[PDB]
Amino acid sequence: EPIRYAIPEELDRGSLVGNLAKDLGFGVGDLPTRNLRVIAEKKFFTVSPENGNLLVSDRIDREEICGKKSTCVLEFEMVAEKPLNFFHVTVLIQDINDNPPTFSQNITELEISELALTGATFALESAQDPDVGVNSLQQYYLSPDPHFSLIQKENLDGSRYPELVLKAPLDREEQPHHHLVLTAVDGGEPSRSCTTQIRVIVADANDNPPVFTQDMYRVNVAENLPAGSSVLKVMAIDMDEGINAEIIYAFINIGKEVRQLFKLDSKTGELTTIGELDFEERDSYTIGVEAKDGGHHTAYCKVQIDISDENDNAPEITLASESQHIQEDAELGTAVALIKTHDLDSGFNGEILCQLKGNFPFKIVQDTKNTYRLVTDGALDREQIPEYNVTITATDKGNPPLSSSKTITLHILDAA
Amino acid sequence: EPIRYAIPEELDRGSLVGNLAKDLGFGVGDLPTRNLRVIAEKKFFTVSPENGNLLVSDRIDREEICGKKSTCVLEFEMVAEKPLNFFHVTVLIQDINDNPPTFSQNITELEISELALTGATFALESAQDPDVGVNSLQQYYLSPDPHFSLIQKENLDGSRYPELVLKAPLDREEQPHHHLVLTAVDGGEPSRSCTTQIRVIVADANDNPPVFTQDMYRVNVAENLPAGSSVLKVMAIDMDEGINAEIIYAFINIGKEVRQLFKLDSKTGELTTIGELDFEERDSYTIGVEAKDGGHHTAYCKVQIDISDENDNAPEITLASESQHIQEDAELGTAVALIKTHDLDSGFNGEILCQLKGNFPFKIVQDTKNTYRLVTDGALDREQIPEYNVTITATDKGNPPLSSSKTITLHILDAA
Ligand SMILES: [Ca+2]
Ligand SMILES: [Ca+2]
Ligand SMILES: [Ca+2]
Ligand SMILES: [Ca+2]
Ligand SMILES: [Ca+2]
Ligand SMILES: [Ca+2]
Ligand SMILES: [Ca+2]
Ligand SMILES: [Ca+2]
Ligand SMILES: [Ca+2]
Ligand SMILES: [Ca+2]
Ligand SMILES: [Ca+2]
Ligand SMILES: [Ca+2]
Ligand SMILES: [Ca+2]
Ligand SMILES: [Ca+2]
Ligand SMILES: [Ca+2]
Ligand SMILES: [Ca+2]
Ligand SMILES: [Ca+2]
Ligand SMILES: [Ca+2]
């Protein structure tokens, strides 16, 4: 007595499903007497009281009636009178491929670190289809890209899900963004498909240490350079982004003498002077500079600062005699005083030009480069001139030249 | 005439440097006549006017006089009178190892990332010594450590500088801090040395992805669960520190039906319900959960939520008859009305118990599980009782059980 029908969905109104009168055992000679009618809350089917045919009365949407279920049957009861009996009739609703697949969003972003090795797999969102059977069985395809390919796996139930695979190492410094196109096609008839774009954003990793522009920063400055003047400026380049690009500068293997003279800026990297320079103390400074970033990548170089000599030291005069006493009966050629000169500067700034200022019965005789002797030249007499105030002047050969004077008193004593 | 002396430094006052009278060509028979005396701004040496010996007058510190210079000579002039002449005398000051080396600071920290490969080199600060020659030539030693060794290189001038080398990979999750001891010994006599501690702080890198406690979170909840109730709580463990340890939770491959029913917290990871559950619509939910951290390390699992059926649907009654008309001359056994019942619930909650309420000349006969027939049992007469109000009651076998009634009017017609 139970009878099942199998018709496709989305059939036009009035389509023939089956002759219930003949399939049960009725006859056109008794159609009006039994008065067939369908009893169901959903007016999906109707029975013609003329020939006993089962027709379609409303739109039969399998996605709205059954959803994602495999089988889809509609059970109702047909009522016949004289006598009154029940006739259970079931109608299987076949599924057609009338719904294309779809993704969650058209544009999907995916952040991938550039440290990802070749062969790394990243999960991609699958497409959904309200159909069932082969009409929902998706087949995923990816547009050709030299860096990415597609992996299509299956679950334990047979559904396919795509996964992105990396076949070439990523580099943000070469290409930070990639644009992919994923396509999903179902296995129904006709084949309906949809597309979606995948924007791969390459995340930055500290894959590049700082690099100085020069491995040696050499400069020459003056001796009396004012405190707080710019000496040079180191520069380090980092191709990364964010914390992996901020560079800090500092000194290495440095001493306290240098620490009180120079100062290196951590941010700008400009080298200045906080102390005083002196050529007579030190004429060269070899300093090492370290460059650090966020990922603790180090970069080392050397800085050499040469100092030129300036004429800032005056010539010094030293004298010595026999208690500043002279005998009036001394012969021509007798040494009376000894002159010693020296200058702390170098080059022509240290060369001293010694001479005698004023007229006196004495004469300066040069022995070596820095030694002189005050030799008598004229007459001496205590009764006439008892003392002489010899003034010695020394002058260097600098620019500007410095000088210094020193007067010594020489007494004249009686003869024997 | 020029004469040079070579004496060590830090000699006691009055030590003999040399006999200037004999080394030049004088004689004890003429010591007081010439009256020897030293002329220098620094009172480092003196000449004895008795025997003509050159002695030490003050402390001679080579580090204070010459500093870091290789050679160290002191030039002065000795003055003799009757006659007056100059005698240039130089004294070379030999260096002794009377100053130990030293570092900048006793405690030195060094941050090293755990991603450092075996053999990585890290610069260490060198020790400084105010001495010169072999007295300042340092020899660095490192205490034995299973992870670190010492590399000793030399510059172009011969000075040694240490560098730390890594022979075993570092792991912050195993040991975040290391304590090293660096020792510097000079090549003088006696050997003076100093020590310094190096605190190596292992910087954290994303070397551990999130790990779920369970690969499957299965739970069973009721059907009419109130919106906003806790379902379960996923948990992911990350052994890293900082941004590399913060975990965010989200859904993957999810649909709109699920998105309007459940909600996953990104921070706490607690799963709640924002919609309504229904067993008649869907009895199982398989959801995938993704765990992401700062370094974009992914972790996937699955969550299955089973729903139990609740008796929240009342039995439905459907009736049909011959236009609600009965002939008074009907035989015992004639079908008058057809009863159809069904319940949306499952199990014993769907089993329907149909019966007739009130005394009537009718009887309910059960055909199948859900079909009944109202069969006459007694006498009928329109002149006496023209109509009957048959009330059919259906009740399920749930807890608590539901029920529904439906009264149909049956008219009695005359005979033929
Ligand atoms: Ca459809
Ligand atoms: Ca369909
Ligand atoms: Ca489809
Ligand atoms: Ca790069
Ligand atoms: Ca960097
Ligand atoms: Ca990078
Ligand atoms: Ca100067
Ligand atoms: Ca100068
Ligand atoms: Ca000068
Ligand atoms: Ca000393
Ligand atoms: Ca010394
Ligand atoms: Ca030493
Ligand atoms: Ca670890
Ligand atoms: Ca982590
Ligand atoms: Ca770690
Ligand atoms: Ca329900
Ligand atoms: Ca229910
Ligand atoms: Ca029920």
Swiss-Prot record, chains A, B:
Glycosylation sites: N106, N389
Residues covered by the Cadherin domain: 1-103, 104-212, 213-317, 318-414
Extracellular side: 1-414
Subcellular location: Cell membrane
Function: Potential calcium-dependent cell-adhesion protein. May be involved in the establishment and maintenance of specific neuronal connections in the brain.
Protein name: Protocadherin gamma-B3
Full-protein residues shown: 31 to 444 of 929
